[PDB]
């Protein structure tokens, strides 16, 4: 006889990889994109990152979101070099040196209503979007930070 264990079961379906390239001819670089690993108690997390424009040219975009969290409660603050806003969706208009930026210490995009149990350094899906243009599937990692033990 054992002890009465609960149930779980392996995952199902899978599907093919998102697509085998993205946008061409954009002289602007990805930083890596990352979420704050959390214990299975708290089905709620956040993402935080930067935007290295690798050239003197002003990129337009909205920032980054996800389908992993049922309410992407997107936030950030900053005054920048006068490129000041207030929280509800980030921004990705770069003043040709106004290297975009978001962090728990200055507010961050909150992934409320999660569902996968993640590992500290797992690979996960981010979806960024243009302000005029299109949507984009991009990679991202997990990394523990503040709220995860």
Beta strand 141-142 with 126-129: parallel, antiparallel or unpaired? Answer: unpaired
**What range does the domain containing 120 cover?**
33-149
Whether 1 is covered by a domain: the verdict is: no
Output the domain CATH number for residue 119: 2.60.40.1890
Method of determination?
NMR
- Residue 133 covered by a domain: yes
Q: Is residue 90 part of a domain?
A: yes
Domain count, the chain: 1
**Listed residue (145, 134, 129) closest to 49, CA to CA:** 145
Q: What is the end-to-end Cα distance of the chain in Å, rounded? A: 33
In a domain, 16, yes or no: no
3-state SS assignment for residue 10: coil
The C-alpha atoms of residue 21 and residue 83 are separated, in whole angstroms, by: 32
The four Cα atoms 137, 74, 143, 11 give a dihedral, to 10 degrees, of: -60
CA separation, residue 48 to residues 1, 7, 44, 74 (Å):
48, 34, 14, 10
């Amino acid at each position: 006889m054992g002890h009465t264990m609960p149930a779980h079961t392996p995952p199902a379906q899978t599907a093919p990889a998102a697509q085998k390239a993205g946008a061409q001819a954009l002289p602007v670089t990805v930083q890596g994109a990352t979420v704050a690993a959390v214990p299975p108690s708290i089905r709620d997390t956040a993402a935080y990152m930067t935007l290295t424009n690798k050239s003197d040219q002003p990129i337009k975009l909205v920032g980054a979101a996800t389908p992993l969290a049922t309410s992407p409660m997107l936030m950030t603050t900053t005054h920048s070099g006068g490129m000041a806003g207030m929280k509800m969706v980030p921004w990705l208009t770069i003043p040709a040196r106004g290297t975009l930026t978001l962090q728990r210490d200055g507010d961050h995009v909150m992934l409320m209503g999660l569902k996968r149990p993640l590992k500290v350094g797992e690979t996960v899906n981010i979806t960024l979007k243009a302000t005029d243009g299109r949507t984009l599937n991009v990679a991202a990692t997990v990394k523990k930070n503040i709220e995860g033990r």
